Structures are given as structure tokens and as C-alpha cells.
Amino acid sequence: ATKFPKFSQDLANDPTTRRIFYAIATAHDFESHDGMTEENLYQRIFASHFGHLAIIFLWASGILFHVAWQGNFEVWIKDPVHVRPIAHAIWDAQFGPGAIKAFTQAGARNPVDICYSGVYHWWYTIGLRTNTELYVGALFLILLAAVFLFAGWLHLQPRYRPNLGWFKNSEARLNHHLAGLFGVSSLAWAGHLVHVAIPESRGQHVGWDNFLSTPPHPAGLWAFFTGNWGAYAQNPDTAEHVFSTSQGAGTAILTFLGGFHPQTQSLWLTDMAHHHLAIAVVLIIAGHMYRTNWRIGHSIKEMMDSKTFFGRKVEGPFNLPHQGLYETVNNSLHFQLSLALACLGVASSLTAQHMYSMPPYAFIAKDFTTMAALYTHHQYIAGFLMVGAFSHAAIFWIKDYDPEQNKGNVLERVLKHKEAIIAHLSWVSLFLGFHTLGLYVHNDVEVAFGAADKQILIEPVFAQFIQSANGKILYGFHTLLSNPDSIAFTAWPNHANVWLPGWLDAINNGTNSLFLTIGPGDFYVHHAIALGLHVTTLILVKGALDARGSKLMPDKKDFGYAFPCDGPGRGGTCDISAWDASYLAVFWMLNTLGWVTFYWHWKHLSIWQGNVAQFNESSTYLMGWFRDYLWANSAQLINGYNPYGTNNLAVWAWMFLFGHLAWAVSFMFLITWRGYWQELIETLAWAHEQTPLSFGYWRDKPVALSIVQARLVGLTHFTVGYIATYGAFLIASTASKFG
């Protein structure tokens, strides 16, 4: 009976090595710790978010401190296209002379790392020009992290620790988060853009000792309150304006040209300030929707139980029974966590899908490796958030769901036909894999036997209609913003498409990624992607809806979320838990984003190298994906160190091979299972006891690690090997052809 772990008693009395491991993996499941009340649960959720916010701020201050200290922001900012950003310095005391010389790069006088995060472009756009501005930002974020470490400690003191009623005050939190956390913050950000970022992109230096005196507009503070709002967009930046200088600059601070800045190939800063200003007002308005304590507002609980639609008998919102859902969502933390992750998983996919097509930061479209890494980062982040959104759906069904409160509501109607949903995800998955693999390997066979004209090539004429419906005149659909005489193009009653000449100038220019040209090769991958999103939804939906149990074991709710099996009886129940559907869907999530990011990378690697006709003519069959993408672009990655030398890709060539090993060692935890290793550890335990001079002896008996743990240990290696291998590929295959 050890002290550790103190949160669970029955794991502290574990005599084996699984209690050190299970303590790590249970240490944050506060709702299952011994002697926990609901009141104490939230007060530890709350106080560990402060400890999390501080880590984000200490991480962010580490970005700033290291480019202030060891970066080349001053050198970079004078030529953001031809010099590489420095991440930090290298101190590996076991480099040879070949690695010092190779990694002494980008105008540095010491080994350094090339920043592929884009923070240089982000800071250059938001108005940071000196290293000292970066340093005081780093110091401020350290102290801002301090006031959240203190606040977290503060709200565990009994006199400051909030009560359960404060946490379950859903209407008051939504009102402030909409109005203040998002509304005021985006209003404040438009304040920075108007006061600092926009003026400093026109040359004038605005700082903390300067900003109180110089107004951002000549008509400041008076055109707003009179109502003469148009004064803020009188003369905008011209098309010959060059960034961070006064030549070509205007005076408009809130103007809505749309499209791209012709010199940075990014969105206009004045167009962003006007954006967050509009978003703020919409968000602040949205934050006055729910009544807090002023009996003017909405009550979410009553918006559920309402059954009267202007006197007409209805069953609830949208004529669907939502009664009891307020007390279901409000008391469930996993329902709330599932919704939050699902909404960050969309906001992070949406981040990736928009920041490549519509680059926000200056000169980021000309930094291909940064642009490529940022997409792959946020899509992989979004894939994990989507898996966790459906993980906590499965926890929600098991632990904090009851049929009594939710009797007859919209949530209980889903369980009534959970097999109709799963059977249909099964059909779509089967449909999309038979006719995408079958169409790829038909194209393989025809190209293999020379008859490349016998490929089945389906033009994606529906997405090409979208592009034509947004402005792309390339295809010739000639409708609806491709038709200059249409109702939508002109907006006949008002003609207020001030955004349209600038946008159509950008969408119809072929040198950007905004609405890329789409061909038959793009058709097939969007069905691989659709097949991917459907199977990994099928695995997760099956795991959430069968978390309560199915005919193979109808009592899964009693066994918890993560259990191995229910023995070999009834045929065998390996991987039966709802946890094993989250485990099984990480493979499909990684696979699917290994199709999204492979397709994003190869499509852009063909545009960037000018060989666009390589992707269009060879992405329709699977060998082209294998010869023209993987085999072709590995050449300079694997030659990062050869017998004849070593270059700046020697670390990417090493992590590429590192991730192959981390991937392969995953198969050990995934293929060979527990009882093999226990009979082998039982033998090594015999050898240690019987041998002389071995004076150590285990405090806790060595056992082969458990069933649900190896599935997690092997899933971590598969993931780390999936990310180190592709991270090294994507960085080295893009930052070797180019700068």
C-alpha cells in the first residue's frame, strides 16, 4: 500500500508495475477518483484550466524569447522572401564539423533551426518590427502566465473556491463568453489592427509611448459618433503599395476591397480590422441572448421543454422532443467536452482550409515549407479533436446518461435506431471503397498496360460548378459570379458588391491557392477523403452508440469505458469496449489525414515546382502517387547524410528514419499481445532471483503491461511514427527543392 497514487486507493495497493502506469493514465479522470463529490470535481476542473492556460502562455513566451534571443527577426524583416526565419539555436555537444557547417545556415554564425511555424510572418503582419518588441512580449506573457498560475491557486482557497451553482450557471457563462471572451477580444484585436498593425504596415511607428497621441485616422472619434462611418474607408492602400512603407499607402482603416494585397499576396490588414470589428458587434449582440438575473433574455431550460409553436401543438424545438436535454447537457461534463472538441475540430480544419487558400500573413504564400507544415499541423490536430469528440460521446453514453430524464426525447430516439445509423455508415463506406479503390486500380491496370486513354476519368463537375459559382471563369459554366449579367454578380437593387472586383481579381489569378484548379485526379481523392471520413465516423459512431451495449455483451455500461474484453466466451470478445472503437478509429483518422495531407502536399508540390501537369496526369492511378510523390520526392530527404557528407536535412533524414522505427515498434504492441510477454517476463523473473551478485529486487512485481495499455502504448508509437515520418518528409521534401 503505497502513497502513490493518492487519488485511487485500490491502485495504490496494486503489488505490480501496472499501478505506476495506470496512475499516469487515470490521474486526470477526476470523476473516477476516490472520495470525489461533484462540488469538488468542478473546482479541480476549473483550477487545472488555469494551470493549462499558463502552459499555453509559457509556451508562447518561449516562441517569442527564442526568436528575440536566437532568431534573426531583425535581419529577416528587411527581406521576408529571401532569408530564412530562425527558430532557435542548436547546442548539441556531439555534432561533428560536418553538422556545425551544415546547420550554420540562413545567415547565422552558429548552428540554428529554420522556423517552419510562420510566427515570423504572423508577427510581421500584426506590427512587430524590433527584437525588443518581441522580448517585452515574451516577458509580458511570462507574467501573464504568472497571474493564471496564481489565479488557479487562488480558486482552491476555501474563501475563493466557487460553488457548484456558479459552475452550472450556463446562461451567465454563454453571455460573457459570447460578449466578452469572443466579442470584446475580437473588438480589442480590431483595436490593435487599427492602432498598431495597419499604421505600422504603412511605415509610421506606433508604440505604447506613441499610440495615445497620434490618431489612427484623420477623422478619429468623430466620424464614428456622428454616423459618418464612410470616412473610415475613403482612400485605401493602392495596388502599388509595398508593405511596411509609406509609399503607396492610404489612410483608410476599415475598408473592404477583398482579395489579396498585391505585394504580400495576403489579405489586407484594413480588411481584417473591419472583419474583427464586424465579428465583435455580431458576437456582442449574440451575448445578450440568455437571461442571467434581469428577467429579459432566454432560459435554455425553458427553450427545451417548450411545446407550443404560436399555439400549435408541437413536440419541441423543430418539432422534435428536446425535454430533459438541459439537465442532460448541464450535468454531463463529457457531453460538454464532446461538443467543445467537435467544434474545435471543425475550427481547426477550417483554419487549415482557409489559411492556405486565403493567406492572412505577409509573405507566407512564398514560404512553401511553412505554408505546408501549417496545413498539415492543423488538419492532424483537427483529426484528433474529432476522435476525442466521439470518444467523450462514448463516455457520455456510459457514465452520465440515464433513460429516466431522457425518456422520449431526441437523445433517446437515436438509440431506438442506432442500428439504422450504423448500417448506413456501413453502406456508404462499402460503396465509397469499392468504387474508389476499384476505380484507382482500374486506372493502375490500364496505365500499366499502356492504355492510359482507357482510364475512367470523372471530371468533378460539381466542385467545378462551385468554383464557377464563386468567380472562376476558367471552366466556362458562366453562371452566378462567372456571369457578369447575373442577379448575384450585380446585386441589382443595391449594387453594393464593393468586395467583388477585388475578390474576382484574386480567384481568377492563377498564382495563388484560392480555389485551385480541379481535375479528375482531384475527384478521386475527394472520395478517398469521403471514404476516410465515413469509416472513421462509422468506427466512432458504432463505438458511441454501442457503448451502452449490444447483443455480444449487453452490459457494457457496468464494465466502464476502457476494459479489455469479456473473455473468450461467446466466440471471443476482443476489442469490444467503446474505448477500442476510439483506439480503432485513430488508425483511420491517421490514415485519412494521410490522404488529405498527401493530396494537399502533392497538389501544391506540383504547382510550386511548376510541374502542374505531373499531378494532373498521374494522380488518377495509384502508382503515380507512389512513384511521382513518395519515390520522387524522397530523393533529397534520404540523401540528407550519405557516405560523402551531410547537409541541413541530416536531422530530417534522421527523424524520417526515427519515425519508421517508432512506427515499427508499434506493431510489436499491436500484433503480439499480453500473455506472450507474461510467460517471458515470468522467465526473466526466475533468472533474476536465481542469479548471484544481482542484489536488486523489484519493489513491485514485473508484469507484462495490460491489454488496454498495450493498445494505447502501440497507438502512441503508431501516431508518433506517423507524425515524425511525415513531418520529416514534408519539411525536407519542400525545404530542399526550395528555400
Partner: peptide
């Protein structure tokens, strides 16, 4: 029973779908 709320919300979404196809097939402007 005759479905009156499932219908007229399915036929409403087909309507929006058929309008989109109308511009698609170069029928209405």
C-alpha cells in the same frame, strides 16, 4: 398517417437542391 412535417422539409431541401441544379445546368440566371 400522411407525413406532413417530414415532407415539406425534405421537399424543401430538394427545392433548394433543384435551384442549385438550375444554375448548374444553365437554366435560370
Amino acid at each position: 398517417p400522411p407525413y406532413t412535417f417530414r415532407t415539406a422539409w425534405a421537399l424543401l431541401l430538394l427545392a433548394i437542391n433543384f435551384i442549385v441544379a438550375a444554375y448548374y445546368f444553365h437554366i435560370i440566371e
